[PDB]
A paper describes a structure:
APETALA2/ethylene response factors (AP2/ERFs) are a superfamily of plant-exclusive transcription factors involved in the ethylene-inducible response. AP2/ERFs contain a highly conserved DNA-binding domain consisting of approximately 60 amino acids, specifically to recognize the [name] box at the upstream operators of defense-related genes, such as pathogen-inducible PLANT DEFENSIN 1.2 (PDF1.2) and PATHOGENESIS-RELATED PROTEIN 4 (PR4). Arabidopsis Ethylene Response Factor 96 ([name], [name]), a member of ERF group IX, contains an AP2/ERF domain and an EDLL motif, and positively regulates defense responses against the necrotrophic pathogens Botrytis cinerea and Pectobacterium carotovorum. In summary, we have shown that [name], an AP2/ERF-family regulator recognizing the [name] box DNA motif, is an ethylene-responsive transcription factor that directly modulates the defense-related gene PDF1.2a.
In this study, we determined the crystal structure of the [name]–GCC11 complex, including an AP2/ERF domain and an EDLL motif at a resolution of 1.76 Å. The complex structure consists of the [name] protein with all 131 amino acids, and a double-stranded [name] box motif with 11 base pairs. The [name] structure is composed of five α-helices and three β-sheets, including an AP2/ERF domain (K14–E74, β1–β3) for target gene recognition, as well as an EDLL motif (F105–L119, α5) for transcriptional activation. The three-stranded antiparallel β-sheet fragment of the AP2/ERF domain binds to the GCC11 motif and crosses the adjacent major groove region. The front of the AP2/ERF domain is the N-terminal α-helix (M1–G9, α1), which docks into the minor groove of the GCC11 motif. A linker consisting of eight residues (A10–G17) connects the α1 helix and β1 sheet, gripping one strand of the DNA double helix between the α1 helix and the β1 sheet of the AP2/ERF domain. Extending from the AP2/ERF domain, three α-helices (α3–α5), including an EDLL motif, constitute the C-terminal region (Y75–K131) in a triangular-shaped architectural design. Residues R16, R31, and R39 of the AP2/ERF domain interact with the phosphate group of base G15, as well as the guanine group of bases G6, G15, and G16. We observed that residues D2, Q3 and R6 of the N-terminal α1 helix bind to nucleotides G10, C11, and T14 of the GCC11 motif and partially disturb the interactions of DNA base pairs in the 3′ flanking region. The α1 helix contacts the template strand of the [name] box in the 3′ end region, resulting in a conformational change of the template strand and slight flipping of the ten nucleotide base pairs from C7 to G16.
Author numbering: 1 to 131
Write the structure that this text describes.
Amino acid sequence: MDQGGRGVGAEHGKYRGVRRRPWGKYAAEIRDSRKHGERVWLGTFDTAEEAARAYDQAAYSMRGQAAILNFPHEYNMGSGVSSSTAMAGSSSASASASSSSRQVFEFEYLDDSVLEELLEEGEKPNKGKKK
DNA sequence: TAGCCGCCAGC
DNA sequence: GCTGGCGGCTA
């Protein structure tokens, strides 16, 4: 976690789950508790705030419960299935000026969300249980 | 500009 | 040993 980072910095402005290149591009990669450190690449982001979130998805997936991530936002949607109010309300007003503006990925961020609930992307039944 | 690699390093 | 992130060559 902070461990890999100390050379650049024990703890600093950029987030956990993040790499920095000379141009400044940011890079998403994860390894598995269970596969002994093999690396699969979740993606690549410019963005540091949604960075933690790229790792969010991945790491909700891996721990399984009480996932180890920065921040605490929990989201509940009601009543539905039919929650246009909650999409629009939670979304507005959340924005990053430089990154979201790249275009098209505005559409996917603008309706939702900021923090999402996903389940065991990491495991394939049958696998009970992890470590 | 991006990805994979490889040591190494703090929790 | 955990799990990231440095880290810098090559892809």
